[PDB]
Each structure stands twice: as structure tokens, then as C-alpha cells.
Design a protein around this ligand. Structure first.
Ligand SMILES: [Zn+2]
Ligand SMILES: [Zn+2]
Lengths: 212, 213
């Protein structure tokens, strides 16, 4: 399987983004998966066009987008994206969409069609903190996952797509009391395990739901 | 004169109390110009839809506002959206554990609450309480209930407004779990009261209450 793996540019006054840092360190072949890496701007207006053009110029079986989830304490594949942008802060283009539909002709939500539970458990099997997240937020990451789901619905029926959020890396939490982080090497190991678990087979129906 | 049905859940997962119901019981019967009816729901995937169906068929409510416990959360959190999946980490009180099951095969992939969720969130914050707009109601009985309300609004009751507010554990539920946040019950009651006061038929606020994760 030929996989496009993306990471995001630094944003919110950070000079580094763990998603891209981790992606840079991935092996170029992980098992039978061949990996192409792409750095996306943290930009609501630019991301969809970059994805569109990239899929138009190259054949990918899978698009797996990685992002920073500052404050999370686990590596978390995402189950679902929702059809709204609601930016707490502006993006890197100083654009702050609030309560805006992403695609008016799209579904209210799209579920990832990667084996998200297999990927989550693969992280856990390596002894790393992993969990299946049920919200990708309402910033550029959710927007990207949503757009991938919209493309699979409307234009690319066989495309497999998903998103994995990762914690801050340690250097990012100076001056942020009680904020979790995870060493970059661990993030890379977890992402590697998740990618290894990617296939066209049915997901694992493990007890990985979130129960309050 | 808005008529609101406010629900809370039964204790579950070896807890003796559920702060959602404890808080709902303590709400005033009138909050602003809103008349409040209270209903305790079982923590049961199979029973909740039938109870809600029968209750809405027999009574006229302008709003159904369901309250639930979100153990581990550190804020009172109105919910933006419900998703069309049950994925139970543990069994419910009937020992039923749906895993990766659609809730209504003929329903939308997700339903957005049509209450002014940002007005509600900000109302909590205005009282000096931790409040946030949540973008996942989980995949247990709470999400199920919110989703079912959205499904009913879509398919049967277009004039109904519906939503969900999760609340933290209360301190009696976290004894010996010092890294687990909680909120005193009286503060939960104050926050729910503030959220209900902010309910109306007007457009929601569009404040910067989104999340980057
Ligand atoms: Zn993100
Ligand atoms: Zn709940």
C-alpha cells in the first residue's frame, strides 16, 4: 500500500510541531507500506487544495494525517470528523472560522475507514499510551480529516483515510504547568506501530470505546 | 413559557450515585421563564429510547435536555454533537455491551444539538465555573441518548430542541483517586441552572469556544 503521511507546520506561537517532527523520523517503508511524507500548512484555506492536488498527481491507497493535540497524554487515532470549523485561535494565515460548515454538500460527519481500533491497539501492544479518540477537535486537524472523508465519499471511493493526534513533545511545555508531553521517540514508535496495522481488512471490534 | 424535560442517569460502573441525577433533583422547578420537569433514566442502551419515545408521545416539551456523568472531565460541558455509533467500553446496567453498532441505520451520521450550546457554555463560565463546549459525548449511553433525541427531531418532531450536558464526578466518587478531577455537587447544580437560563429560541452565540483538540 502506498501511503501519504502528513504532518502540520508549527502554530500558536510554537516553533515546532510534533506531528511533522514524528513524520520526518518514520522509515520510508513500514512492512509492506511505502511512505511518502508531506508537510501541510496549518491553514484552513490551503489544506484542502494541497490534498486535492497531491491526490491528482500521485496514486495513494491511504492518506494518514498526523497532528498535534496539545494537552493529550496518549497517541490517538481518530474515529470521526464533523462538518464544522470552529477555531479557538486564528490559523497561520490569521484566519479564524467560527461555526462554519466545511462542505455544505457533505455529510454531517465522516467516519475514518482505516482500522482505527487495530491501530490503537497496536500502539498499546508496544507499551505506549494509546486511545481511540471520538473528536478530532474543530481546528485544522478535524478540517483535514473531514475533507478526506468528503473526498472518499464524492470522488475517491477506494481511498482509505484517517488521522492520528499526538501529544506535545517535551520541549513544547516549558511555561505550561501540569501539561502532558511525550518523548518524540515514543511518538515515532507509536505511529510506526499504527501504520503497521493498516490494511484493507475489517477493523478489530475491541472494547476501546469511551465510557464516562 | 418554555417546557423543558431535564433528565439524569442512574448510577453505573459500581458507583452508588450518579451526579447527573443528583444535580437534576436539586434544580428548581422554574428556572427563568423555563418550567422544568425531571426524569431519571436507566443507564441502559435498550430502555432509554423507549422511555424517551413514550414520554415525548404523551407530553409536550419544547426542549429535552439530558444530563450525564463524564468521569474524568474537569468542566461542565454542553455537547455540540452526537454520532451514530454505540461503542460501549463496559456493559450497561442490563449487561448489554454494543460494540461498533449503528444506533439508527436510517439516521444521519451525526446530529448537532439545536440548543444554543455556546450561550449555555458561556453562561456557566459567567458564573465563575469551569465550562467548555464538548465535541464528543462519548460512545456510551449518553451519546446514544443525544443521538436518539436528534433522530426524533429529524424524523418526527421538527419543533423540538434538544441537547446534552455532561458534568464531572462529585468528590465522593474520587476518594483515593487524587489525579481525577471532580466538582462539588452544589457547583454542578449552579452551572446547570445557568446553562438552562441561557436557553431560548434565539440564534446561538458565536464566541471563540472551539477546540484545537
Ligand atoms: Zn490537531
Ligand atoms: Zn455520559
Amino acid at each position: 500500500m502506498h501511503i501519504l503521511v502528513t504532518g502540520f507546520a508549527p502554530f500558536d506561537n510554537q516553533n515546532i510541531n510534533p506531528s511533522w517532527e514524528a513524520v520526518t523520523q518514520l522509515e520510508d517503508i513500514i512492512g509492506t507500506h511505502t511512505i511518502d511524507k508531506l508537510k501541510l500548512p496549518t491553514s484552513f484555506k490551503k489544506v484542502d487544495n494541497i490534498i486535492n492536488k497531491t491526490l491528482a498527481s500521485n496514486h495513494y491507497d491511504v492518506v494518514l494525517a498526523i497532528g498535534q493535540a496539545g494537552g493529550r497524554n496518549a497517541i490517538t487515532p481518530e474515529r470521526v470528523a464533523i462538518n464544522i470549523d470552529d477555531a479557538r485561535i486564528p490559523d497561520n494565515d490569521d484566519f479564524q472560522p467560527i461555526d462554519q460548515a466545511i462542505h455544505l454538500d457533505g455529510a454531517p460527519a465522516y467516519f475514518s475507514n482505516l482500522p482505527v481500533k487495530a491501530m490503537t491497539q497496536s500502539i498499546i501492544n508496544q507499551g505506549l499510551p494509546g486511545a481511540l479518540s471520538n473528536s478530532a477537535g474543530t481546528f485544522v486537524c478535524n478540517h483535514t480529516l473531514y475533507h478526506l472523508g468528503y473526498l472518499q465519499d464524492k470522488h475517491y471511493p477506494h481511498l482509505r483515510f484517517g488521522f492520528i493526534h499526538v501529544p506535545y513533545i517535551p520541549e513544547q511545555v516549558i511555561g505550561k504547568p501540569d501539561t502532558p508531553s511525550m518523548p518524540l521517540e515514543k511518538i515515532v514508535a507509536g505511529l510506526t506501530a499504527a501504520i503497521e496495522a493498516i490494511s484493507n481488512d475489517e477493523d478489530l471490534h475491541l472494547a476501546l470505546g469511551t465510557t464516562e
